[PDB]
Design a protein around this ligand. Structure first.
Ligand SMILES: Nc1nc2c(ncn2[C@@H]2O[C@H](CO)[C@@H](O)[C@H]2OP(=O)(O)O)c(=O)[nH]1
Ligand SMILES: [Ca+2]
Length: 104
């Protein structure tokens, strides 16, 4: 069980796909939701080793299973590129400061 584990949140590949589709849709229409304007470009400061090509975009994936629509983001995120490919799943949980750690 769990294709991705961010902290204690367990996500299946289906949860990730759904979250990605919603994030990508907004990106291609040029729209954003939430105070931090999601989805927004992800600069990958930490140099995560994503295999897919940049640019990258940060989009919240909620543990409640709902698609993000502007409320509180939480700590988990799906990163995808303009080719609509999954770059990876990361979280703020377990990281210090304003950094991320990859979900296992
Ligand atoms: N932690 C972090 N924030 C990022 C990254 N890429 C983009 N951001 C967010 O997007 C802005 C533009 O690069 C940054 O100031 C940062 O704002 P936040 O800390 O407000 O999320 C990244 O790799 N790591
Ligand atoms: Ca952020």
């Amino acid at each position: 069980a769990c294709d991705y584990t961010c902290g204690s949140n367990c996500y299946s590949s289906s949860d990730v796909s759904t979250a990605q589709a919603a994030g990508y849709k907004l990106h291609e229409d040029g729209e954003t939701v939430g105070s931090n304007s999601y989805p927004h470009e992800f600069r990958n400061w930490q140099g995560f080793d994503f295999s897919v090509s940049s640019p990258y975009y940060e989009w919240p994936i909620l543990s409640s299973g709902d698609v993000y629509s502007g409320g509180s983001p939480g700590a988990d995120r799906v990163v995808f590129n303009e080719n609509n490919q999954l770059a990876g799943v990361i979280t703020h949980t377990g990281a210090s400061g304003n950094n991320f750690v990859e979900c296992t």
